Amino acid sequence: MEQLKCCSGILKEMFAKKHAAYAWPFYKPVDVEALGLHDYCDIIKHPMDMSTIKSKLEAREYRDAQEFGADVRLMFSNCYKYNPPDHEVVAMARKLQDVFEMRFAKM
């Protein structure tokens, strides 16, 4: 679909240098072992990150833009669920979500 090409463009924007200061904690799966977040899998049933989303899009795992969008929002929701609301990573997720929501609304 044309909307799946729009999804590739959303990912290029989210990975761009302009947003790297707040997007970088979302680039790859949360490394629970390196970060000592041994309670993460008890709270987060479905972990999600930008590289996994990119691989799924490349592998045609999304039928349309809504399925793609649901994984991007799952990534943010995981961050909002796991961390206290005042956490630095939550502010970063909000900034990255602003980039996504603005671009997603254009299609």
Q: Which residues bind ligand 87M (CB under 6 A)?
A: 25-28, 30-31, 35, 79, 82-83, 88-89, 92
| In the complex, least distance from residue 107 CB atom to ligand 87M, rounded to whole angstroms | 25
| In the complex, least distance from residue 51 CB atom to ligand 87M, rounded to whole angstroms | 8
Alpha helices by DSSP H, listed for the chain, are 2-14, 20-23, 32-35, 40-43, 50-58, 65-82, 88-105
Considering the complex, state which of residue 7 and residue 48 has its C-beta at the smaller distance from ligand 87M: 48
| In the complex, least distance from residue 84 CB atom to ligand 87M, rounded to whole angstroms | 10
Q: Which of 41, 80, 82, 48 is nearest to 67 (CA)?
A: 48
